[PDB]
Write a protein that binds this ligand. Sequence first.
Ligand SMILES: CN(C)[C@@H]1C(O)=C(C(N)=O)C(=O)[C@@]2(O)C(O)=C3C(=O)c4c(O)ccc(Cl)c4[C@@](C)(O)[C@H]3C[C@@H]12
Ligand SMILES: CN(C)[C@@H]1C(O)=C(C(N)=O)C(=O)[C@@]2(O)C(O)=C3C(=O)c4c(O)ccc(Cl)c4[C@@](C)(O)[C@H]3C[C@@H]12
Ligand SMILES: CN(C)[C@@H]1C(O)=C(C(N)=O)C(=O)[C@@]2(O)C(O)=C3C(=O)c4c(O)ccc(Cl)c4[C@@](C)(O)[C@H]3C[C@@H]12
Ligand SMILES: CN(C)[C@@H]1C(O)=C(C(N)=O)C(=O)[C@@]2(O)C(O)=C3C(=O)c4c(O)ccc(Cl)c4[C@@](C)(O)[C@H]3C[C@@H]12
Ligand SMILES: [Mg+2]
Ligand SMILES: [Mg+2]
Ligand SMILES: [Mg+2]
Ligand SMILES: [Mg+2]
Ligand SMILES: [Mg+2]
Ligand SMILES: [Mg+2]
Ligand SMILES: [Mg+2]
Ligand SMILES: [Mg+2]
Ligand SMILES: [Mg+2]
Ligand SMILES: [Mg+2]
Ligand SMILES: [Mg+2]
Ligand SMILES: [Mg+2]
Ligand SMILES: [Mg+2]
Ligand SMILES: [Mg+2]
Ligand SMILES: [Mg+2]
Ligand SMILES: [Mg+2]
Ligand SMILES: [Mg+2]
Ligand SMILES: [Mg+2]
Ligand SMILES: [Mg+2]
Ligand SMILES: [Mg+2]
Ligand SMILES: [Mg+2]
Ligand SMILES: [Mg+2]
Ligand SMILES: [Mg+2]
Ligand SMILES: [Mg+2]
Ligand SMILES: [Mg+2]
Ligand SMILES: [Mg+2]
Ligand SMILES: [Mg+2]
Ligand SMILES: [Mg+2]
Ligand SMILES: [Mg+2]
Ligand SMILES: [Mg+2]
Ligand SMILES: [Mg+2]
Ligand SMILES: [Mg+2]
Ligand SMILES: [Mg+2]
Ligand SMILES: [Mg+2]
Ligand SMILES: [Mg+2]
Ligand SMILES: [Mg+2]
Ligand SMILES: [Mg+2]
Ligand SMILES: [Mg+2]
Ligand SMILES: [Mg+2]
Ligand SMILES: [Mg+2]
Ligand SMILES: [Mg+2]
Ligand SMILES: [Mg+2]
Ligand SMILES: [Mg+2]
Ligand SMILES: [Mg+2]
Ligand SMILES: [Mg+2]
Lengths: 91, 91, 91, 91
Amino acid sequence: TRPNHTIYINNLNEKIKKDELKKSLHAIFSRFGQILDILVSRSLKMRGQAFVIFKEVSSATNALRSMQGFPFYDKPMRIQYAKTDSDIIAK
Amino acid sequence: TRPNHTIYINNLNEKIKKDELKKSLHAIFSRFGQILDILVSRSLKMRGQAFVIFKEVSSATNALRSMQGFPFYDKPMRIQYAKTDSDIIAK
Amino acid sequence: TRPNHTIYINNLNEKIKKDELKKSLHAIFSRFGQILDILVSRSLKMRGQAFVIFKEVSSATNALRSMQGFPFYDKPMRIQYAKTDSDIIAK
Amino acid sequence: TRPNHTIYINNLNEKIKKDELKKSLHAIFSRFGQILDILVSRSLKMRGQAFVIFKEVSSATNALRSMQGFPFYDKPMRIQYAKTDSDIIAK
RNA sequence: GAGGGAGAGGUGAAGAAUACGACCACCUAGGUACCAUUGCACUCCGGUACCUAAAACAUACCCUC
RNA sequence: GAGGGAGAGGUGAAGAAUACGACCACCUAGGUACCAUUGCACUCCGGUACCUAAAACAUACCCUC
RNA sequence: GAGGGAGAGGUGAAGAAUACGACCACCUAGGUACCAUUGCACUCCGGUACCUAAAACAUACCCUC
RNA sequence: GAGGGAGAGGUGAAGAAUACGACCACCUAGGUACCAUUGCACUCCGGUACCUAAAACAUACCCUC
Ligand SMILES: CN(C)[C@@H]1C(O)=C(C(N)=O)C(=O)[C@@]2(O)C(O)=C3C(=O)c4c(O)ccc(Cl)c4[C@@](C)(O)[C@H]3C[C@@H]12
Ligand SMILES: CN(C)[C@@H]1C(O)=C(C(N)=O)C(=O)[C@@]2(O)C(O)=C3C(=O)c4c(O)ccc(Cl)c4[C@@](C)(O)[C@H]3C[C@@H]12
Ligand SMILES: CN(C)[C@@H]1C(O)=C(C(N)=O)C(=O)[C@@]2(O)C(O)=C3C(=O)c4c(O)ccc(Cl)c4[C@@](C)(O)[C@H]3C[C@@H]12
Ligand SMILES: CN(C)[C@@H]1C(O)=C(C(N)=O)C(=O)[C@@]2(O)C(O)=C3C(=O)c4c(O)ccc(Cl)c4[C@@](C)(O)[C@H]3C[C@@H]12
Ligand SMILES: [Mg+2]
Ligand SMILES: [Mg+2]
Ligand SMILES: [Mg+2]
Ligand SMILES: [Mg+2]
Ligand SMILES: [Mg+2]
Ligand SMILES: [Mg+2]
Ligand SMILES: [Mg+2]
Ligand SMILES: [Mg+2]
Ligand SMILES: [Mg+2]
Ligand SMILES: [Mg+2]
Ligand SMILES: [Mg+2]
Ligand SMILES: [Mg+2]
Ligand SMILES: [Mg+2]
Ligand SMILES: [Mg+2]
Ligand SMILES: [Mg+2]
Ligand SMILES: [Mg+2]
Ligand SMILES: [Mg+2]
Ligand SMILES: [Mg+2]
Ligand SMILES: [Mg+2]
Ligand SMILES: [Mg+2]
Ligand SMILES: [Mg+2]
Ligand SMILES: [Mg+2]
Ligand SMILES: [Mg+2]
Ligand SMILES: [Mg+2]
Ligand SMILES: [Mg+2]
Ligand SMILES: [Mg+2]
Ligand SMILES: [Mg+2]
Ligand SMILES: [Mg+2]
Ligand SMILES: [Mg+2]
Ligand SMILES: [Mg+2]
Ligand SMILES: [Mg+2]
Ligand SMILES: [Mg+2]
Ligand SMILES: [Mg+2]
Ligand SMILES: [Mg+2]
Ligand SMILES: [Mg+2]
Ligand SMILES: [Mg+2]
Ligand SMILES: [Mg+2]
Ligand SMILES: [Mg+2]
Ligand SMILES: [Mg+2]
Ligand SMILES: [Mg+2]
Ligand SMILES: [Mg+2]
Ligand SMILES: [Mg+2]
Ligand SMILES: [Mg+2]
Ligand SMILES: [Mg+2]
Ligand SMILES: [Mg+2]
């Protein structure tokens, strides 16, 4: 994919409760720049995944490159740019 | 919060015994500067949490920024400045 | 061993499914340069092990040195140069 | 303690078999310099502990400082200088 | 008589031909399994169930003669 | 007659008033729990036990009338 | 009469000498164990089993007198 | 007679018409589950329970004829 304000994370530990996952993702990622939102759902299709929306695409890029494969509750994070803009970025 | 000599850590693994937790927190954090004390309680309200008191606010700041989200017994540490001075700092 | 386009990893967590292992190994290693392939088998003789084939021996060398002992699904990765060229490198 | 060619590690995961522990400790530590030996015993008194003997005290010092608190099979390593020279260093 | 065995987390009560372990009452520290808890403190203190807390001798107690 | 229900991992055999799922035989991929394995490859392939592999109709099969 | 005890996730129905908890019907949030899921979203929503959702009084209900 | 089957961690004892596996005694390495242990070493060595330690033939042993 191509750089995007939003990174898509998967291979996340699915036992982690939604709000803990968000707070923890925030703690991994805030070092890279300002975060607008972190979206998590534990539904069947969306579990093990998160979207982290940065204010700036440069934050997204550094995040993705630095945290690629990083240990997070016992599994390595796999990180991609989101395939499309998040609503709050497009709008 | 605002910088403080003391950092507040949570999202800690609650199976870890108090003295092990302290010794381990000391090993994460001593690289950042001198530590006056580490307070841990496994009570219901205080489990999963620690206070690490640095001699210098600059140590606290580097600690917090470097170790934010860091893997510690299988969970990411979440770090904040303490909301108030610890007794040994105020007094 | 002597430098090789291919690194041999072992001490891998054997519960991890083959395609997850590959995707995760790719996420640990792609930072070091271009990867031609990652070979994994869960057979008795080959479980807990992977071969990661880099385009360039310099990528292999940096990978091996940086990721040596690195946490990966709860175990430290142990990394060596492959003892021989992978087919796609020799051919 | 005072710098020593040998570092003493504890808080090690005690489920890990002796030879795996050695190979893994070797993989954490060889980046710091040449290692003469790694001693591990799983006896009651000596389990959860290792001695890593470096050729040079400077290797020991960098190791200790860099790897202090580092994640190793799910627990943070706690590192000290050995209190005395190992036999192979004294002799 | 012999010879073996087992009992002390702490305080008490009982008993005292007994410094001494069971029974009974009360109180503590530490842990384990499960459940609940994401929580900002600077005497301690969630729940349910289980476990552990130096030890020889002697009395009493158990086995063999 | 009505009305309900359940059966297809793949190939075969049986049966065919039947494209069609059970029984029987054979073969595959993927997984789970436990045990074993630290192992250098570039067709696949450790063990023990369990599970899963699109699905409507029709025949046959099960229930009510 | 006395004295004890237990019941409210939410809506309803029943009942109302009763604001009030069981039974019955319906609906929600959160979790746990196991199984399945590697998945690109920007109302929610996999399965199987289990659990939890402030609480005093009163009626009714249970025990002792 | 035929044909099938199963037994060797190591040392010993028994037995020897037998190099040879069961029974019995003793000793080792490695592991697993649970419990305990945070511990500074440079012969080994916590507990409780379970498991594993190359293997063909022959004797003996088990099944069919
Ligand atoms: C109170 N009396 C009946 C007993 C008694 O008189 C004794 C005696 N020596 O005569 C006791 O020692 C006893 O009072 C006494 O203290 C006993 C005692 O200490 C004890 C302990 O500690 C552990 C196990 C046991 Cl079986 C006993 C036990 C049963 O011996 C009791 C016994 C009584
Ligand atoms: C061989 N014969 C006794 C049966 C038969 O003649 C049939 C028939 N239609 O007459 C079949 O279909 C059958 O040959 C036939 O194929 C059967 C069949 O397919 C089936 C399946 O697939 C699943 C469940 C069931 Cl209970 C059956 C079952 C029992 O109907 C069998 C029946 C036989
Ligand atoms: C409908 N009738 C038989 C009962 C009745 O007439 C009552 C009464 N006060 O007379 C009720 O309160 C009742 O209608 C009524 O509502 C009952 C009730 O609320 C209740 C609750 O909440 C919890 C436990 C229990 Cl045991 C009861 C229970 C049994 O008392 C019922 C009783 C009935
Ligand atoms: C001592 N005597 C009764 C037996 C004997 O005389 C033998 C014989 N060949 O006559 C043995 O081989 C025996 O002494 C002997 O050594 C036996 C033996 O080795 C053995 C093993 O290794 C495994 C399984 C089994 Cl069932 C046996 C077993 C039962 O055959 C014994 C048998 C005895
Ligand atoms: Mg790291
Ligand atoms: Mg006792
Ligand atoms: Mg004792
Ligand atoms: Mg006592
Ligand atoms: Mg005393
Ligand atoms: Mg007294
Ligand atoms: Mg007594
Ligand atoms: Mg008295
Ligand atoms: Mg306690
Ligand atoms: Mg929990
Ligand atoms: Mg408790
Ligand atoms: Mg005694
Ligand atoms: Mg089926
Ligand atoms: Mg199907
Ligand atoms: Mg079939
Ligand atoms: Mg077909
Ligand atoms: Mg056919
Ligand atoms: Mg048929
Ligand atoms: Mg036919
Ligand atoms: Mg398969
Ligand atoms: Mg294993
Ligand atoms: Mg298998
Ligand atoms: Mg159907
Ligand atoms: Mg209730
Ligand atoms: Mg309630
Ligand atoms: Mg209700
Ligand atoms: Mg209301
Ligand atoms: Mg109503
Ligand atoms: Mg009522
Ligand atoms: Mg009415
Ligand atoms: Mg819910
Ligand atoms: Mg899974
Ligand atoms: Mg569910
Ligand atoms: Mg009440
Ligand atoms: Mg055997
Ligand atoms: Mg054998
Ligand atoms: Mg033997
Ligand atoms: Mg021999
Ligand atoms: Mg002999
Ligand atoms: Mg014999
Ligand atoms: Mg003889
Ligand atoms: Mg052993
Ligand atoms: Mg433990
Ligand atoms: Mg043992
Ligand atoms: Mg044989």
